[PDB]
């Protein structure tokens, strides 16, 4: 129904919904994780198992994709999973059609391009940071190694790696929320809930496929 | 939490090197017990044999 936004002015226009929706994710990430690190135990108590099994999962998709030096990049990929996992699970589960902002919807931080192309650039700096730290500053992975005539293929591969990784995450969350927006207008909520469970299924997966592929460009730059 | 992952793992691993060290020390105790009992035995054998031949 509504694909628009209201802008907030600080000299330029920025989206009110994106900042506001994102803040809840930030408060629900730091507010729930830092309640278990207050008094840890040797044998993990109730509630610390879930935050440990997440951290052991992030070490899986870092070590398999990067290699022996996964351990500096764990807090980066740990953010790019959890900031995108919780942002999608906040959209389906937190009831925000009761609250009415006077100009726009509130579903997810990733419904605008402004989040998803920023997260596609934060993972784009990361494989230029890893690409220019470990290897030489003069020549790095874009250097035309197998054949010299592969130059326009590999220049354009620089542009497609943040762009295809952005519109993957941008579209499937915007699609999932719109199916919720459209089907409510037709029918009460007892019908679209299997479609929401099909959506909440892929809502967490597109976060997982982000952080898996985000680590996969790190290991390519280190070679 | 990273330290906790290491702490439980290093401690579990540490016990492993400790139990291996204890088994190597019990093997060296068995070898020193071997050498000390055969030390007393071969002491007596050589001493009685030499002193026997000499005073014969």
Q: Which helix (H) or strand (E) holds A166?
A: helix A151-186
Secondary structure tally for chain A: helices H, strands E? 6, 2
Neighbours of A112 (CB within 10 A): 19
* Partners of residue A56 in chain B, C-beta under 8 Å: 5
Do A158 and A149 form a contact (C-beta atoms < 8 A)? no
* Partners of residue B7 in chain A, C-beta under 8 Å: 42
Question: Could you give the angle at which helices A151-186 and A113-133 cross, rounded to 10 degrees?
Answer: 150
| Residue A35 backbone phi and psi in degrees, to 5 | -90, -15
Closest residue of chain B to A59, computed from CA coordinates: B2
* Partners of residue A30 in chain B, C-beta under 8 Å: none
d(CA A70, CA A62): 5
**Contact between chains at A42 and B8 (C-beta distance less than 8 A):** yes
DSSP state at residue A14:
E
d(CA A136, CA A132): 6
A60 touches chain B (CB under 8 A): no
**Token code pair at residue B24:** 């190597």
E-strand stretches of chain A: 7-9, 13-15
**Contact between chains at A42 and B1 (C-beta distance less than 8 A):** no
Residue A210 to residues A26, A69, A119, A174, B24, Cα–Cα distance (Å): 19, 20, 10, 16, 50
Q: Which of B1, B7, B11 sits opposite A55 (nearest CB)?
A: B1
d(CA A190, CA A192): 6
d(CA B21, CA B5): 24
Q: What is the resolution of this structure in A?
A: 3.2
Q: Which of B5, B8, B11 sits opposite A55 (nearest CB)?
A: B5
Start-end of H helices in A15-105: 16-33, 48-63, 74-93
**Contact between chains at B8 and A74 (C-beta distance less than 8 A):** no
Measure A171 CA to nearest chain B CA, in Å. 34
A55 touches chain B (CB under 8 A): yes
A160 touches chain B (CB under 8 A): no
Residue A183 to residues A170, A176, A187, A205, Cα–Cα distance (Å): 20, 11, 6, 22
At A8 the three-state DSSP class reads strand
The approach used to solve this structure was cryo-EM
d(CA A91, CA A178): 11
Q: Are strands A13-15 and A7-9 parallel, antiparallel or unpaired?
A: antiparallel
**Contact between chains at B1 and A74 (C-beta distance less than 8 A):** no
- Indicate the domain borders of chain A: 1-223
Closest residue of chain A to B12, computed from CA coordinates: A42
Do A124 and A162 form a contact (C-beta atoms < 8 A)? yes
Do A108 and A87 form a contact (C-beta atoms < 8 A)? yes
């Amino acid at each position: 129904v509504g694909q628009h936004f209201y802008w907030q002015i600080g000299g330029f226009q920025i989206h009110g919904q994106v900042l506001i929706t994102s803040w809840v994710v930030i408060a629900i990430l730091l507010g729930s994780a830092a309640i278990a690190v207050r008094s840890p135990q040797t044998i993990p108590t109730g509630g610390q198992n879930f935050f440990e099994y997440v951290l052991e999962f992030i070490r899986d998709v870092s070590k398999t994709q990067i290699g022996e030096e996964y351990r500096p990049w764990v807090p980066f990929i740990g953010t790019m999973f959890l900031f995108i996992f919780v942002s999608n699970w906040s959209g389906a589960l937190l009831p925000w059609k009761i609250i009415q902002l006077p100009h726009g919807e509130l579903a997810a931080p990733t419904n605008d391009i402004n989040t998803t192309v920023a997260l596609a650039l934060l993972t784009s700096v990361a494989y230029f940071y890893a690409g220019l730290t470990k290897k030489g500053l003069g020549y790095f992975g874009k250097y035309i190694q197998p054949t010299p005539i592969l130059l326009p293929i590999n220049i354009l591969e620089d542009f497609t790696k943040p762009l295809s990784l952005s519109f993957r995450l941008f579209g499937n969350i915007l699609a999932d929320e719109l199916v919720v927006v459209v089907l409510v207008s037709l029918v009460p909520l007892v019908v679209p809930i299997p479609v929401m469970f099909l959506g909440l299924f892929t809502s967490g997966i597109q976060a997982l496929i982000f952080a898996t592929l985000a680590a996969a460009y790190i290991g390519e730059s280190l070679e | 939490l990273g330290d906790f992952m290491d702490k439980r793992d290093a401690s579990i691993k540490e016990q492993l090197s400790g139990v291996k060290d204890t088994s190597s020390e019990v093997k060296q105790l068995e070898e020193q017990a071997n050498a000390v009992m055969r030390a007393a035995r071969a002491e007596i054998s050589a001493a009685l044999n030499k002193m026997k031949k000499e005073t014969q």
